[PDB]
């Protein structure tokens, strides 16, 4: 063919429900290859003002090829619906896994953190900042490996970021200057938080109210429980630094002792 | 249903260079309407990888009808060029004007700040945050009425149930996203009255540093009331900056604007 059509796919069980439609299991007829076909209702999308967000999500993700990133193979659409052709992740989200096992041993944690850091190093390599990563957006491939799969708040970094900032500098506010210097480093906080959630089974800054959680994060108020080892305390402490710049680099997270020691 | 084509216009003289192509004066052959035609070259946009920044700035601007914002009426594209059909601003830029007068009087500045604040209100009322405004991006219509012209840094505004995972810097600065446009106004106000922006310095590093420390000074001729205004706008914490209504009502503005 040239273009995808819905008629290329046998369609199996629903793999779950999203905001704007449902994900199905599916098979391409001519090669019998198994994938997931995500279905998004144009009506609900246009009523929620997220067409451009979707566009960004599909464009960004379709250009990433990495074992720890979920493949988006293609899209197409008909009068009512937009269809995404994604790699199928057999073993569920990390969220569901986390809440059966309560928390993970350090072997799993380090493994996932390594898998994550590789994925973000690659994203960064190709000028993409992933932003909101939570367990729900982490799926599991056949051999147990992480696949990042949201990109809902993912942005292409403007390139020439020293030159393009420098020159309009007089005019932009502190917020905007810091925003664009270290937006990169936002992905390091996320590793820290997640690593913490993996060992402990709940994020560092959980609270009754959004306002407290907000003060907690704002002041970096967290404490480890006893069973968390020094190597872990060390790594998370380094990742959860208030001032973006003091956070390590992905290169230093790969090299870190506690990681190498437990990463399989 | 009928769609723009290149031979719907008489291509006149150039109005400027620009990074990825040129802006020409032009006339719509049927209606005789004088407009401005911005021509960009696909092969340069692809090489710089700025097509999505173009798309966004065109999507955003073309859905903005306001006396103080440059109308972009439409676009089309042939095999090699992209064309943007813009309102035509005869009297050049506020950058030229400011060089030719060195600085502006209270009456001109308050008037210009009123037009910026109105255009900015409208923008926000459409969930659009302008972000970066230089005087180079501020053109003048044929009554010298002010026209916001660049939108390269502008974004469309949306939130949570997900903060547990957000860093402080995305938490803050964002969800105080309006107040970025208030800073810009403070800098323009200072600049119009004084001749140059308040954080200008030898080095980018001197400058940057000044911006964070919010270290500036007022020349002796800047009136108490302009200072008041400028000082509320240039606040470190976006929370403490006023709203665009408080700017339009501020007594110094109403005291000096040639017109509301």
């Amino acid at each position: 063919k040239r273009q995808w059509a819905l008629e290329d796919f046998e369609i199996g069980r629903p793999l779950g429900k999203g905001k704007f439609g449902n994900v199905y299991l599916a098979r391409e007829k001519q090669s019998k290859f198994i994938l997931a076909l995500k279905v998004l209702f144009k009506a609900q999308l246009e009523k929620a003002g997220v067409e451009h967000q979707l566009r960004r999500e599909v464009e960004i993700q379709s250009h990433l090829r990495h074992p720890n990133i979920l493949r988006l193979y293609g899209y197409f659409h008909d009068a009512t619906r937009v269809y995404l052709i994604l790699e199928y992740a057999p073993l569920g989200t990390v969220y569901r896994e986390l809440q059966k096992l309560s928390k993970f041993d350090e072997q799993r944690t380090a493994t996932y953190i390594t898998e994550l850091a590789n994925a973000l190093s690659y994203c960064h390599s190709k000028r993409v900042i992933h932003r909101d990563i939570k367990p729900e957006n982490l799926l599991l491939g056949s051999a147990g490996e992480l696949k990042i799969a949201d990109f809902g708040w993912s942005v292409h970094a403007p390139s020439s970021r020293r030159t393009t900032l420098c020159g309009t500098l007089d005019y932009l506010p502190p917020e905007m200057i810091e925003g664009r210097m270290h937006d990169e480093k936002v992905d390091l906080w996320s590793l820290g938080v997640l690593c913490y959630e993996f060992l402990v089974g709940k994020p560092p800054f959980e609270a009754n109210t959004y306002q407290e959680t907000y003060k907690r994060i704002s002041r970096v108020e967290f404490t480890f429980p006893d069973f968390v080892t020094e190597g872990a305390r060390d790594l998370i402490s380094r990742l959860l630094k208030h001032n973006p710049s003091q956070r390590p680099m992905l290169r230093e997270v790969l090299e870190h002792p506690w990681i190498t020691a437990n990463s399989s | 249903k009928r769609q723009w084509a290149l031979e719907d216009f008489e291509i006149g003289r150039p109005l400027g260079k620009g990074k990825f192509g040129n802006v020409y004066l032009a006339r719509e052959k049927q209606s005789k309407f004088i407009l401005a035609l911005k021509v960009l070259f696909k092969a340069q946009l692809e090489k710089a990888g700025v097509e999505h920044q173009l798309r966004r700035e065109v999507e955003i601007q073309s859905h903005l009808r306001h006396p103080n914002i440059l109308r972009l009426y439409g676009y089309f594209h042939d095999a090699t060029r992209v064309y943007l059909i813009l309102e035509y601003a005869p009297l050049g830029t506020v950058y030229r004007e400011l060089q030719k007068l060195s600085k502006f009087d209270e009456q001109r500045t308050a008037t210009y700040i009123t037009e910026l604040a109105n255009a900015l209100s409208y923008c926000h009322s459409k969930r659009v945050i302008h972000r970066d405004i230089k005087p180079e991006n501020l053109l003048l219509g044929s009554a010298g009425e002010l026209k916001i012209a660049d939108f390269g840094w502008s974004v469309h505004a949306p939130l949570c149930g997900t903060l547990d995972y957000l860093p402080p810097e995305m938490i803050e600065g964002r969800m105080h996203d309006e107040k970025v446009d208030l800073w810009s106004l403070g800098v323009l106000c200072y600049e119009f009255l004084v001749g140059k922006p308040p954080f200008e310095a030898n080095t980018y590093q001197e400058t940057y540093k000044r911006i964070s420390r919010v270290e500036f000074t007022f020349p002796d001729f800047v009136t108490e009331g302009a200072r008041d205004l400028i000082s509320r706008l240039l606040k470190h914490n976006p929370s403490q900056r006023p709203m665009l209504r408080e700017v339009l009502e501020h007594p110094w503005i109403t005291a000096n604007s040639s017109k509301p």
Partner: peptide, 17 residues
């Protein structure tokens, strides 16, 4: 893939007046 240059922006001929 090059860009299609499809924008969600007007491309229709307009009568002026």
């Amino acid at each position: 893939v090059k860009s299609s240059y499809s924008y969600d922006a007007p491309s229709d001929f307009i009568n002026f007046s």
